[PDB]
mmCIF file of C-alpha atoms in Angstrom:
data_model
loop_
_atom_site.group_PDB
_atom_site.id
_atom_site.type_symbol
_atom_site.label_atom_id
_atom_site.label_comp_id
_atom_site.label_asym_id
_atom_site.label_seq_id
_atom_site.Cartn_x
_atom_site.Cartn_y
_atom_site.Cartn_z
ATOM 1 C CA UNK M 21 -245.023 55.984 0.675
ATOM 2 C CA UNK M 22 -246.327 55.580 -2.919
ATOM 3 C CA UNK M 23 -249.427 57.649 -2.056
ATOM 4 C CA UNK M 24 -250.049 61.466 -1.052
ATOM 5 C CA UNK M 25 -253.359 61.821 1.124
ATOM 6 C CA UNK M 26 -254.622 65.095 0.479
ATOM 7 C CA UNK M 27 -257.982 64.108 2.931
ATOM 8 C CA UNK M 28 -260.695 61.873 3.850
ATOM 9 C CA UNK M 29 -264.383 62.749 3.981
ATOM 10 C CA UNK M 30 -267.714 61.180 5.240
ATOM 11 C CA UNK M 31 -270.820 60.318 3.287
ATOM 12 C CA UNK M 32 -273.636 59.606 5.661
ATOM 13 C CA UNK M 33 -277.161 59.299 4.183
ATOM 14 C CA UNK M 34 -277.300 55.730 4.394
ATOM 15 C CA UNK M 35 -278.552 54.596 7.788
ATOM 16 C CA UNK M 36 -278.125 50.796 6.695
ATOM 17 C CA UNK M 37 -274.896 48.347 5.813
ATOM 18 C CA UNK M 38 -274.014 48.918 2.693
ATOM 19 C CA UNK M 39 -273.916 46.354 -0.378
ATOM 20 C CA UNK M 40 -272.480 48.726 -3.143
ATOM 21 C CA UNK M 41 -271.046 51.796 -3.447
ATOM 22 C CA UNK M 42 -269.450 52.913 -7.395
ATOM 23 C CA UNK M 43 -268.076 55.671 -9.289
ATOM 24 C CA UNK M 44 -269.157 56.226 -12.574
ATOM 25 C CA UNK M 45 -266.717 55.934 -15.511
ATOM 26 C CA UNK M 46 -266.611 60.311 -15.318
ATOM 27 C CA UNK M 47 -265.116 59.850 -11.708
ATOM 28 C CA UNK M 48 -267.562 62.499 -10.882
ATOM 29 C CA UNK M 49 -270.441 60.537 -9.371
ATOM 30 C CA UNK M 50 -271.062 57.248 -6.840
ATOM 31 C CA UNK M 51 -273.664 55.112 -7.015
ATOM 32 C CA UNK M 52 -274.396 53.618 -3.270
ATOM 33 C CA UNK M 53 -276.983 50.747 -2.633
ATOM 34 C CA UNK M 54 -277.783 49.339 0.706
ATOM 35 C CA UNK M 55 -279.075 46.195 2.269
ATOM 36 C CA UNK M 56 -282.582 48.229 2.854
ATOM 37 C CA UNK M 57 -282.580 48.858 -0.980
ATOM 38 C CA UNK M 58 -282.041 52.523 -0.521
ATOM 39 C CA UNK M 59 -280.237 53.615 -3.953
ATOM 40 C CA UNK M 60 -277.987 57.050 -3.163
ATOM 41 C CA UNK M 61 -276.687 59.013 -6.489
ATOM 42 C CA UNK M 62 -274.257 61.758 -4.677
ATOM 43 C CA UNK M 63 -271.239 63.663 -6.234
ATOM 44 C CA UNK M 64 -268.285 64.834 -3.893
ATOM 45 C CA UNK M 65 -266.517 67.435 -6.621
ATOM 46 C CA UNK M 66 -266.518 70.207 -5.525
ATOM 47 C CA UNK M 67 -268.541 68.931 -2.156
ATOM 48 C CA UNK M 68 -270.445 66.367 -1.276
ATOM 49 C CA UNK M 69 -274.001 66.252 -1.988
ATOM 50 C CA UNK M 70 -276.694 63.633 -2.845
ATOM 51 C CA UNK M 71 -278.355 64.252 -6.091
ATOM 52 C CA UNK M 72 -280.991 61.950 -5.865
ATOM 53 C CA UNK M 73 -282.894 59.219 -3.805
ATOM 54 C CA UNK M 74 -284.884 56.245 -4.509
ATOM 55 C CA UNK M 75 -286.007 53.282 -2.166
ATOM 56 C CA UNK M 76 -286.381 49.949 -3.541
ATOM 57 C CA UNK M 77 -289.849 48.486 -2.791
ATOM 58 C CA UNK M 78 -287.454 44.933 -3.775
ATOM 59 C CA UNK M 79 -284.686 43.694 -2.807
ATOM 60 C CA UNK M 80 -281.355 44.634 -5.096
ATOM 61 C CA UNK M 81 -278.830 42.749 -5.567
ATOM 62 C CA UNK M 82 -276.666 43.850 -8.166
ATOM 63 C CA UNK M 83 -275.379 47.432 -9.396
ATOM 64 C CA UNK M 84 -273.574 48.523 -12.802
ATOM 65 C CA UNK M 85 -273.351 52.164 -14.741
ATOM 66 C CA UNK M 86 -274.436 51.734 -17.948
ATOM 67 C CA UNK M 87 -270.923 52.299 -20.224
ATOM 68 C CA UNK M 88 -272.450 54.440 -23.655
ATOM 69 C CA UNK M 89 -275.397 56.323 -21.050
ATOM 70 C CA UNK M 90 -273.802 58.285 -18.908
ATOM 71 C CA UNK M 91 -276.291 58.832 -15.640
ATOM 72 C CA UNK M 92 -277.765 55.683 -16.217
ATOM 73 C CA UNK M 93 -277.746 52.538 -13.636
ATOM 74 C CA UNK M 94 -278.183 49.448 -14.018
ATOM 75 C CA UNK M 95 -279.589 48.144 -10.842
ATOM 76 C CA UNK M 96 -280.531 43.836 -10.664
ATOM 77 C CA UNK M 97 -282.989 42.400 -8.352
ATOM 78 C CA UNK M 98 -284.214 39.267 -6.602
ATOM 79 C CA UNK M 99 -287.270 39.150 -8.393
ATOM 80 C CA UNK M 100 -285.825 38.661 -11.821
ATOM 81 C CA UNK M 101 -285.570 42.026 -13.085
ATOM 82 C CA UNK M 102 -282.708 44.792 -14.347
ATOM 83 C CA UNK M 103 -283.779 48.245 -13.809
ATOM 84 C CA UNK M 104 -282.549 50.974 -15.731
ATOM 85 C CA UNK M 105 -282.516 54.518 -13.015
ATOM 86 C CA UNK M 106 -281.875 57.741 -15.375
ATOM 87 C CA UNK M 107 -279.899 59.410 -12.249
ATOM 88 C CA UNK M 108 -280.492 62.907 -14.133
ATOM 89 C CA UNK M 109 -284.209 62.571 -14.803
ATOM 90 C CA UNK M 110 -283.947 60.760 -11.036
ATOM 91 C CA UNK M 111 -286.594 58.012 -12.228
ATOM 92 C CA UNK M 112 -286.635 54.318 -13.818
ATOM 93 C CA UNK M 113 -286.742 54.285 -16.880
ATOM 94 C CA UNK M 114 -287.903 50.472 -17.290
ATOM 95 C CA UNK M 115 -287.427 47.288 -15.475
ATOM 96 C CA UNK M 116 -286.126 44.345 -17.524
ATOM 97 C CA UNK M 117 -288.175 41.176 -16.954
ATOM 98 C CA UNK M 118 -284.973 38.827 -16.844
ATOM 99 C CA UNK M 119 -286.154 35.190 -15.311
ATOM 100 C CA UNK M 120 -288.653 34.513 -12.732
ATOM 101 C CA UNK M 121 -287.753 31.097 -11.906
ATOM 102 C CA UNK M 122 -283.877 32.411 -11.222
ATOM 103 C CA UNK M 123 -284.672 35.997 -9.862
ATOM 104 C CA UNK M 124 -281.312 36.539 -8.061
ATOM 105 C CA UNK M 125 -279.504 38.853 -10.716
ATOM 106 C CA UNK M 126 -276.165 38.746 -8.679
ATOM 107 C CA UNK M 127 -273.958 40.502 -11.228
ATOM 108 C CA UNK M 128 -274.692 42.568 -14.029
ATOM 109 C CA UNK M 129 -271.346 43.490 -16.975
ATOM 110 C CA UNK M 130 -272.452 46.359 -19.329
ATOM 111 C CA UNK M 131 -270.209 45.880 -22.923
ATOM 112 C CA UNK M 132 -267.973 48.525 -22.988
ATOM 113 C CA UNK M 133 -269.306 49.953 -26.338
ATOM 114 C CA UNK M 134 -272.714 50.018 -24.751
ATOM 115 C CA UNK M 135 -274.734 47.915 -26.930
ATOM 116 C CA UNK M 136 -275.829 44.926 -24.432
ATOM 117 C CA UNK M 137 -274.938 43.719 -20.872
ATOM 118 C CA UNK M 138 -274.287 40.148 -19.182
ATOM 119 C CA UNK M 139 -276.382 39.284 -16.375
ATOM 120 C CA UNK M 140 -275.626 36.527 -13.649
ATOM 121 C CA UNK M 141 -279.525 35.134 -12.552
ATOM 122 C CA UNK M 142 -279.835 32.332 -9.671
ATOM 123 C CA UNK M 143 -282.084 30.376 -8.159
ATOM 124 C CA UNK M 144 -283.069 30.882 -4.684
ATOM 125 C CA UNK M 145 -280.538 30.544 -1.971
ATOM 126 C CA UNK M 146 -280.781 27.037 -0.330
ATOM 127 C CA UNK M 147 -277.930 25.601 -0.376
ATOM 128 C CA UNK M 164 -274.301 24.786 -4.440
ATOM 129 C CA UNK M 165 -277.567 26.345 -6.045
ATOM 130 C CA UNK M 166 -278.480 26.066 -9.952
ATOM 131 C CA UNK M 167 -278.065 29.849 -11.910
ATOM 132 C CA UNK M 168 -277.702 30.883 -15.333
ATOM 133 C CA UNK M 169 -275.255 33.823 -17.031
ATOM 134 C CA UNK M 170 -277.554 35.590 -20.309
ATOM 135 C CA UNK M 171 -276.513 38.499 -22.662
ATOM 136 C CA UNK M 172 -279.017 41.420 -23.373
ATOM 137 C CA UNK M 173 -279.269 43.211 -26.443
ATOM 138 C CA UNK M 174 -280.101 47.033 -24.806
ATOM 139 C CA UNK M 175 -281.518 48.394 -28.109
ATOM 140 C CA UNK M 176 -284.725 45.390 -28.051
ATOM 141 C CA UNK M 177 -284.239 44.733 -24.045
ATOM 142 C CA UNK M 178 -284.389 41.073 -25.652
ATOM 143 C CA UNK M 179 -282.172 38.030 -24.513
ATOM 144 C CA UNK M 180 -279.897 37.750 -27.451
ATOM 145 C CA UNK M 181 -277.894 34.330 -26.024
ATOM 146 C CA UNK M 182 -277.525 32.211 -23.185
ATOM 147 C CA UNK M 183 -273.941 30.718 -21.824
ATOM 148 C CA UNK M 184 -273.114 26.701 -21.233
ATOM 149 C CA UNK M 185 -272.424 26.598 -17.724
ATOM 150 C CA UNK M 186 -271.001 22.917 -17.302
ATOM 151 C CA UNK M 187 -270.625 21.029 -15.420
ATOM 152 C CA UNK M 188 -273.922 21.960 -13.950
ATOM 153 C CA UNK M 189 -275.816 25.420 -14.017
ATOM 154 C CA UNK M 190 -274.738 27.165 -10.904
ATOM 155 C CA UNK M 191 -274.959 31.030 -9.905
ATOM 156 C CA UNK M 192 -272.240 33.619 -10.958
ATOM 157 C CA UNK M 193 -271.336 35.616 -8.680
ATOM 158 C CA UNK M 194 -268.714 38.026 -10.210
ATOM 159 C CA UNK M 195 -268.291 39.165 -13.718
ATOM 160 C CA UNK M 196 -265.685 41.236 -15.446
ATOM 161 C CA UNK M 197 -265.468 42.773 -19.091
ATOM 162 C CA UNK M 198 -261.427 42.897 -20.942
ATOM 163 C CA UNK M 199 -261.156 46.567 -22.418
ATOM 164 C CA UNK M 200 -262.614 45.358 -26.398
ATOM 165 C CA UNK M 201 -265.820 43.533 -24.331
ATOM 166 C CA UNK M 202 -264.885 40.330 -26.223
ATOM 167 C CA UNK M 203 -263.830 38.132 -23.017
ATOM 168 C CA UNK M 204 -266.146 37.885 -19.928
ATOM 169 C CA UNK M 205 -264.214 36.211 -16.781
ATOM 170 C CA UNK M 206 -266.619 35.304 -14.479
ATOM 171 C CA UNK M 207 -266.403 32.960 -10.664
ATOM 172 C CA UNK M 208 -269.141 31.124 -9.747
ATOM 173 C CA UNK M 209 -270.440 29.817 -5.699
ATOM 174 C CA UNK M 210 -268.709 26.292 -7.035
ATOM 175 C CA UNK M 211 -265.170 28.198 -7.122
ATOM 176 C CA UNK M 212 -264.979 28.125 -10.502
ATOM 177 C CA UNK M 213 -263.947 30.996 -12.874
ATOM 178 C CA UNK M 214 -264.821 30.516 -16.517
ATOM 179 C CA UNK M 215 -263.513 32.743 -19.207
ATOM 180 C CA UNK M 216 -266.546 33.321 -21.787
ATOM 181 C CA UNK M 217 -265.833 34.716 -25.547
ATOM 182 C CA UNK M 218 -268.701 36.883 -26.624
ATOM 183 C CA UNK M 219 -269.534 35.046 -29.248
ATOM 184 C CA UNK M 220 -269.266 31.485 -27.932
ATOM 185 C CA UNK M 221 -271.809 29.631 -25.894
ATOM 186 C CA UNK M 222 -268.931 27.661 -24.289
ATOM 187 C CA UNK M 223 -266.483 29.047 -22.289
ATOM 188 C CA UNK M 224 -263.196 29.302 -23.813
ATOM 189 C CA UNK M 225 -261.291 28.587 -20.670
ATOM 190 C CA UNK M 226 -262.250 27.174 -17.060
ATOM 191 C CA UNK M 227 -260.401 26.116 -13.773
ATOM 192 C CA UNK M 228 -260.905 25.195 -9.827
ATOM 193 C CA UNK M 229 -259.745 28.657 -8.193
ATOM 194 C CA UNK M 230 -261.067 28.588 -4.363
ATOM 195 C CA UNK M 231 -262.248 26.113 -1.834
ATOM 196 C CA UNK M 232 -266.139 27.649 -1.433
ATOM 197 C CA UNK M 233 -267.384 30.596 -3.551
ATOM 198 C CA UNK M 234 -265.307 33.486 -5.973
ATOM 199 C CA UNK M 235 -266.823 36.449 -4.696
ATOM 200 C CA UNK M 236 -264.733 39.156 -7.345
ATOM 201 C CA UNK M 237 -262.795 38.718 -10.292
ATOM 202 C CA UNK M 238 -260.859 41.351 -12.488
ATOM 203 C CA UNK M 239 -258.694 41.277 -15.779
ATOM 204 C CA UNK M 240 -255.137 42.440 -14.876
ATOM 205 C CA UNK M 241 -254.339 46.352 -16.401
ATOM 206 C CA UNK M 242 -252.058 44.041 -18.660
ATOM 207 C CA UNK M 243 -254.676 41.669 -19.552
ATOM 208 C CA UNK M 244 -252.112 38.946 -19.159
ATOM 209 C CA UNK M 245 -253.521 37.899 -15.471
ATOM 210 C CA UNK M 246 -256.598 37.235 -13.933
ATOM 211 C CA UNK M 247 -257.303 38.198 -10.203
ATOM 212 C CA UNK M 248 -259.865 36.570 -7.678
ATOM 213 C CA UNK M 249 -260.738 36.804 -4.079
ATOM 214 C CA UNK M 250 -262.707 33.943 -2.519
ATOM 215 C CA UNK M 251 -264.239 32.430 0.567
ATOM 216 C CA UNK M 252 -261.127 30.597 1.473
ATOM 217 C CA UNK M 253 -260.028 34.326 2.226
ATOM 218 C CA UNK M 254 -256.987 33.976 -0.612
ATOM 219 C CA UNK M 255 -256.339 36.633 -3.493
ATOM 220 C CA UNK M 256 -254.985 34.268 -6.713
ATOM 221 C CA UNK M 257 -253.573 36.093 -10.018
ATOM 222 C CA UNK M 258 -254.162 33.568 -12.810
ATOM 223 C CA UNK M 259 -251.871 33.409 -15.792
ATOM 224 C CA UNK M 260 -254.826 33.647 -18.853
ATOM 225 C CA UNK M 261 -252.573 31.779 -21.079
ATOM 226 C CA UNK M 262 -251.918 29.437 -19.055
ATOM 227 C CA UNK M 263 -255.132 27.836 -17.693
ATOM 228 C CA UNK M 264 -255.308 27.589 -14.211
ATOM 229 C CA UNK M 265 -251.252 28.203 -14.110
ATOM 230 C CA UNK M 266 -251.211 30.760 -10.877
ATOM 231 C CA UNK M 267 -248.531 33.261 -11.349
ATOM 232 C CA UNK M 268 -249.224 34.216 -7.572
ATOM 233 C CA UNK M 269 -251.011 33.261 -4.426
ATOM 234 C CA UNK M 270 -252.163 35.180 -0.802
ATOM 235 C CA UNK M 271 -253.934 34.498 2.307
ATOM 236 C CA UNK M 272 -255.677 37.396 2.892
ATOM 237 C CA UNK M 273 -257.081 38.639 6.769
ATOM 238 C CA UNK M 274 -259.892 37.267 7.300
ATOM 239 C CA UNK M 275 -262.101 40.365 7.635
ATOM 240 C CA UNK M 276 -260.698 41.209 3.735
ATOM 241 C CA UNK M 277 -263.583 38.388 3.024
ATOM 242 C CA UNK M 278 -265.545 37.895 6.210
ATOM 243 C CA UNK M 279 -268.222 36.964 6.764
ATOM 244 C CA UNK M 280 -268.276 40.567 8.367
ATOM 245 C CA UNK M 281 -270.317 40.635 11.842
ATOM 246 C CA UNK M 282 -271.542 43.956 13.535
ATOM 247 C CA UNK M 283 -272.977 43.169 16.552
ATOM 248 C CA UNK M 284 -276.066 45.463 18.913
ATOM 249 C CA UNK M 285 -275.722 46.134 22.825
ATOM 250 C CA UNK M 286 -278.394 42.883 23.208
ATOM 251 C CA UNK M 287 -276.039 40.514 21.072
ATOM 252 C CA UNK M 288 -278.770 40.842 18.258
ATOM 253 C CA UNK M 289 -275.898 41.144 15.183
ATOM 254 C CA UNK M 290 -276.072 41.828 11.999
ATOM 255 C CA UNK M 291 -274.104 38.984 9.296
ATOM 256 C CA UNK M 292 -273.131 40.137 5.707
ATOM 257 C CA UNK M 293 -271.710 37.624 3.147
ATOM 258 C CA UNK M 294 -269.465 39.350 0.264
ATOM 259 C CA UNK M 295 -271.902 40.845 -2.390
ATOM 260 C CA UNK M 296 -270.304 43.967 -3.558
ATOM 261 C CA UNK M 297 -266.532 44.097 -5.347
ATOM 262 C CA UNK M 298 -264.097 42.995 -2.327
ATOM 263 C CA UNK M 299 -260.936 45.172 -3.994
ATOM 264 C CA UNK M 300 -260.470 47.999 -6.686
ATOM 265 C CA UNK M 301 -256.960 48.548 -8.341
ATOM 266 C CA UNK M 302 -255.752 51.975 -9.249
ATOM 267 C CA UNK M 303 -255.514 53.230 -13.010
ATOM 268 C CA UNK M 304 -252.608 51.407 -13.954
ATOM 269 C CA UNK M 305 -253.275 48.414 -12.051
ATOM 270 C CA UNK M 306 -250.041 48.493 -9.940
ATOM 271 C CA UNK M 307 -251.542 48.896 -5.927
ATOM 272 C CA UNK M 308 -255.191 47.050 -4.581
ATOM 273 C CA UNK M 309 -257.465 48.139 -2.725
ATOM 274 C CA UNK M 310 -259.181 45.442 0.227
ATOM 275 C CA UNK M 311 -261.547 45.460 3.292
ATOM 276 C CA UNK M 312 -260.962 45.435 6.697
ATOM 277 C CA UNK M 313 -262.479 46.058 10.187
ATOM 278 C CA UNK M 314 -261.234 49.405 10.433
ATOM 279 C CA UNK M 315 -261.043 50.275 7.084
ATOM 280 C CA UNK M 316 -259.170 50.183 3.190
ATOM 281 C CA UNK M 317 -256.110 48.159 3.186
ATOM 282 C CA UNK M 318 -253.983 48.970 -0.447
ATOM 283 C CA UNK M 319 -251.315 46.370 -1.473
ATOM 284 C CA UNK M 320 -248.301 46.528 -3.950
ATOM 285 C CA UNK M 321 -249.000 44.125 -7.012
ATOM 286 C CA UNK M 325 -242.088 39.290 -4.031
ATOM 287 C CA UNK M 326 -243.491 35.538 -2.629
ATOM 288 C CA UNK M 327 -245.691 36.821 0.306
ATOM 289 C CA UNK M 328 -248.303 40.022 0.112
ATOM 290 C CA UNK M 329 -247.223 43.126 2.601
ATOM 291 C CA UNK M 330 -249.726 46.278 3.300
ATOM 292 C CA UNK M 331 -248.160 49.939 1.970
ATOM 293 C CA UNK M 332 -251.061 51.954 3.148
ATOM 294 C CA UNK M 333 -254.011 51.849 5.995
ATOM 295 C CA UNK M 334 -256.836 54.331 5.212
ATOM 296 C CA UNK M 335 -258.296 53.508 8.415
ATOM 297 C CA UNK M 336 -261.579 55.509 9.434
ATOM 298 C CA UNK M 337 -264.362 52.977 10.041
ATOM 299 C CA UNK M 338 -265.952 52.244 13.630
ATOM 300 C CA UNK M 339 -267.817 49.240 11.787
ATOM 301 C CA UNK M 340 -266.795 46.773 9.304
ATOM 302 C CA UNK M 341 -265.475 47.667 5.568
ATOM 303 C CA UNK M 342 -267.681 45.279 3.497
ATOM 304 C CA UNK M 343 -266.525 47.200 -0.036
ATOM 305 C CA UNK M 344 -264.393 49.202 -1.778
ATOM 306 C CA UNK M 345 -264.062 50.939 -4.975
ATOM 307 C CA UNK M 346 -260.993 53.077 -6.158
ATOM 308 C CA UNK M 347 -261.846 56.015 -9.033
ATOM 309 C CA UNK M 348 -259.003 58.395 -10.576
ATOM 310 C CA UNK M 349 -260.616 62.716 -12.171
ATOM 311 C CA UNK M 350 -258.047 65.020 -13.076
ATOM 312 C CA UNK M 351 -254.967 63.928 -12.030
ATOM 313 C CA UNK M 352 -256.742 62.467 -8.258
ATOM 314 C CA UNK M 353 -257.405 59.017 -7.121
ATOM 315 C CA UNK M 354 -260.200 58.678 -4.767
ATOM 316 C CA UNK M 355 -260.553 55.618 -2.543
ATOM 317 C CA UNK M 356 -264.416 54.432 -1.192
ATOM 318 C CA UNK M 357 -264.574 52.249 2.106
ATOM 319 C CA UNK M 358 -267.939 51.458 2.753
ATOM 320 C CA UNK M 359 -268.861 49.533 6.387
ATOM 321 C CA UNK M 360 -271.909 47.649 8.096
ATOM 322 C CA UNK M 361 -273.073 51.321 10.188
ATOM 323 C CA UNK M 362 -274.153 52.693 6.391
ATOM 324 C CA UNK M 363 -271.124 55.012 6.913
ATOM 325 C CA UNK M 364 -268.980 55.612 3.233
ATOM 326 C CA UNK M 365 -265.412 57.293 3.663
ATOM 327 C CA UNK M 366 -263.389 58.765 0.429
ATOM 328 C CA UNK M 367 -260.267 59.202 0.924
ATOM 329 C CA UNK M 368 -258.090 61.252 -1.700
ATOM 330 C CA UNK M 369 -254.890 60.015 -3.261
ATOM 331 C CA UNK M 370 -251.940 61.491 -5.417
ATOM 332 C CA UNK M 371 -249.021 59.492 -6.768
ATOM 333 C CA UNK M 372 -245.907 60.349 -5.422
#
């Protein structure tokens, strides 16, 4: 028993499945976006609360904190746009006219020091679709560059920032992830990692590793030094990477394909967080992958996670297909 729960709570103003759900880099606020484009800014320190509201007239696809403005989101579209929500003011700020031929902004990266973001924009969804990955100067709101994807353009799905913001890994709906230097068009490193799409990717704590979870349902850790050299390999459950079904009392069900991050790591990078029917799954980072803690909680579906640590406290979010968000608080033993 590596963890101590101290409790779980309930947040339950969304009354739709939800997409995203993220703590801000303070720990002290989550950011929760659902399929019906209902935005929630709540804090649950010292209760929980919602401290603001907005519904999307659009459809959003994509949701990032901004890293220099606190209280600033970063929330992508599918009409080719990036809006900027001031969660203090509780109003946009702007919306970022990104691409209208590609206007599925499936992932958005802020640079840690603040000064620009990378932005994943797709065509529509009809089948292996063409996409393009594009970094923002947020000073102008200008495209500064645009990234070779090669073979073909195709649509990121997944991007992740190392701690300097100087390498971008990134997987793509071909099953590709390509490492991108910042100031490189081309990539400086690519491989085959899944059989279908990547749906998340994250630097080790380490840096040494690469992790992605994909639609063959298998977590890979990728030595970075080593292109394409896997340092380890898991079949995951099946409802860690659905698709993830919820079904009405006529048969008339509900089907989500992974949008939001499918695991979170602790601070130090050492346990995982994962979805399942019934709720967050955490994993030990020998040869075959066994479960250490079941959060449990859900009467629907976990379709994402996140995993937060303020003073001293890790707090786990399981979000499921009902709208329903648990948090469920962690200390170290």
């Amino acid at each position: 028993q590596p963890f101590i729960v101290l409790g779980q709570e309930e947040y339950g103003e969304h009354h739709s499945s939800i997409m995203h759900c993220r703590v801000d880099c303070s720990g002290r606020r989550v950011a929760s976006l659902d399929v019906d484009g209902v935005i929630k800014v709540w804090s649950f320190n010292p209760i929980m609360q919602t401290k603001a509201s907005s519904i999307s007239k659009s459809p959003l696809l994509s949701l990032e904190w901004a890293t220099k403005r606190d209280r600033l989101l970063l929330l992508g579209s599918g009409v080719g746009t990036v809006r900027l929500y001031d969660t203090e003011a509780k109003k946009n700020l702007c919306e970022i006219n990104i691409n209208d031929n590609m206007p599925r902004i499936l992932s958005l990266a802020c640079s840690p020091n603040g000064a620009s973001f990378v932005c994943s924009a797709a065509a529509p969804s009809l089948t292996q679709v063409p996409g393009r990955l594009l970094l923002w100067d947020t000073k102008t709101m200008k495209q500064q560059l645009q990234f070779s994807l090669d073979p073909e353009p195709i649509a990121i799905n997944c991007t992740a920032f190392n701690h300097n913001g100087n390498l971008l890994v990134t997987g793509a709906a071909d099953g590709v992830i390509r490492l991108f230097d910042m100031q490189q068009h081309e990539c400086a490193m690519s491989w085959r990692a899944h059989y279908g799409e990547v749906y998340s990717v994250e630097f080790s704590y380490d840096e040494n590793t690469v992790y992605s979870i994909g639609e063959d349902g298998k977590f890979i850790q990728w030595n970075i030094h080593k292109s394409g050299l896997k340092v380890s390999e898991y079949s995951l459950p099946s409802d860690a990477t659905g698709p993830f079904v919820l079904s009405g009392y006529s048969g008339y069900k509900q089907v989500q394909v992974p949008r939001g991050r499918l695991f979170a790591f602790d601070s130090e990078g050492n346990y995982m967080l994962t979805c399942s029917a019934t709720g967050g799954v955490i994993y030990k980072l020998e040869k075959v992958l066994e479960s250490c803690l079941s959060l449990g909680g859900h009467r629907a579906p976990v379709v994402t996670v996140d995993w937060s640590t303020a003073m001293d406290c890790g707090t786990c979010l399981t979000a499921s297909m009902d709208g329903k968000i648990k948090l469920t608080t962690l200390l170290a033993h």
